[PDB]
Amino acid sequence: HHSGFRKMAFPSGKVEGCMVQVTCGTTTLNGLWLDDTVYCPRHVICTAEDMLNPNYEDLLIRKSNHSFLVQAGNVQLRVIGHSMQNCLLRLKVDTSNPKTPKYKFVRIQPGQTFSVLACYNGSPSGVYQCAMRPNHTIKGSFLNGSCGSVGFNIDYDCVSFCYMHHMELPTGVHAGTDLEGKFYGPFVDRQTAQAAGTDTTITLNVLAWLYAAVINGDRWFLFTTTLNDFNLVAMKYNYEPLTQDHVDILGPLSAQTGIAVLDMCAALKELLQNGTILGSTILEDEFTPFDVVRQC
Amino acid sequence: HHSGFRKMAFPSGKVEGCMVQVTCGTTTLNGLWLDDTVYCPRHVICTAEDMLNPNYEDLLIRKSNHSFLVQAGNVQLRVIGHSMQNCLLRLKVDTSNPKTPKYKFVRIQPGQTFSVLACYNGSPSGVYQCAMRPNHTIKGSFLNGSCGSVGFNIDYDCVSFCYMHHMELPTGVHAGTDLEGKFYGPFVDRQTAQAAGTDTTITLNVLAWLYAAVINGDRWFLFTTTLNDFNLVAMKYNYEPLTQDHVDILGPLSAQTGIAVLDMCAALKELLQNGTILGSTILEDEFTPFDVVRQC
Ligand SMILES: *[C@H](O)[C@H](C[C@@H]1CCNC1=O)NC(=O)[C@H](CC(C)C)NC(=O)OCc1ccccc1
Ligand SMILES: *[C@H](O)[C@H](C[C@@H]1CCNC1=O)NC(=O)[C@H](CC(C)C)NC(=O)OCc1ccccc1
């Protein structure tokens, strides 16, 4: 039986109206236009050679308002102020964006998911769903020219911006900032080898997703266990330890299925100790309990 | 190494501006508002009992322009004409949609992909990527209230609408129409058991996707073969036979990788005859050669 449960992004239209192209010299990336401010990654001011070890304060002294070409489709927005805000530039412009949605800036926590609007040369290209990893990377789909693309959640009428894209690490995963310009994790916007912590599997999301498999009809993977025994297993297999807070979070899903959280933990325990579910021959950890519900 | 290759939907903003809510009696679903026309599934005129065996011509005689409540956010659009167009209603309205994009209607072929904007009560909820299956179903994510949600591709400024959602089959997969109201496949909009052909795997897309794995660094699955020998294998494993047209289609990918199409076919042959690649412990067949390229 085809469940239809799958990764789904939020509708992107509210964010598409906010994307501009920002060029400084021969570097081009994307900017986010909200009211009369355009935010973009500060390494737009870098040349090729600068990115290996940039002195951002120094590179910026050589720039002026007129150094930044901001393009919203056909129009050119006039820059009337520029300043560095952590790893972003804040470019003040003469025109407030009439398509500015209701919005807020949010610093998401590891394990939380969001939608990415991937953009190139200021033009949206595609949308997909991502998670903030325990080691503060995200496993995105980003190519050259994608910096300044943003991640977001929508709640009713309101866009909560949580991510702006800056860089790719040697393992192919991605690092970036919140919209206050502050990197997630220990990363810095320099093109030198940087290592992410080893990456833990998001237990809370695996559990929620194993619930979805049960809500969709699957159950071949269902013994019980205790919190401390499961956490002993989790430490062995690079899963995050479970807390009572997470148990409470899973409450609703546990009711609908009439399956005990700790019974699900015992199923997960066997799977880890032994070795398909909703298709994947592995355990999906980028669905939150929220996502599993919204989608049912 | 994390490739980042993944299913990506088109940005949905152009389509979001076209979605309305259509209610007739106690049945509510989604409509598509383009210029001064609203399209929706004709089973909006059905009650519960009607859907088991509907006489649509007869149910419609009992309706009038004022039977259809069309809601675009706050506004109510006045219906000034209604007619049946195959399995859709065409509802003429007094107001041309100012957010109508450049668009066309396209009947897609099996193997082609498109984005779905899933909607409920006229409000977009999420976006994801789907394929038209060889047996003319799609493996969607649709719940009650989702009918009238549409599938689409975007090429530059232009939306090509290819799907409107009508129904779920007993296996959990989905059936619907193009925007001229014509079902894909042999299905009809009646809630009785209907069987889809057995579903073939889309060889052309599997090959393209095995190319992506090579473009992303993977190669553990790479002997050669001939077209007729591979097609002998394909028939055994419920894969579509390969043609020279498909070989030509794969030309570009074959160049970039410097790997012969038929060499890839030999890799696929072993995998089928023997038994991970870009993550999946199985072979993804809902990426077209187009998608693999656009994303590189
Ligand atoms: C901004 O568009 C760009 C996005 C990178 C390029 C390829 N994939 C991405 O996610 N960011 C950078 O190029 C970044 C700039 C520094 C000042 C931080 N450097 C970087 O990501 O280096 C690693 C890398 C570059 C090119 C291909 C693969 C990895
Ligand atoms: C329209 O929103 C609705 C969408 C179905 C409901 C659940 N998942 C879907 O994709 N379409 C129908 O309810 C359809 C109407 C007939 C006149 C064709 N009937 C239908 O799909 O029956 C099968 C079914 C119903 C409910 C749950 C699962 C399967």
Residue numbers in the entry:
A (entry chain A), B (entry chain A): -1 to 220, 223 to 275, 280 to 300
Paper passage:
Overall, the hydrogen bond interactions are nearly identical relative to SARS-CoV-2 3CLpro.
The SARS-CoV-2 genome encodes two polyproteins which are processed by a 3C-like protease (3CLpro) and a papain-like protease.
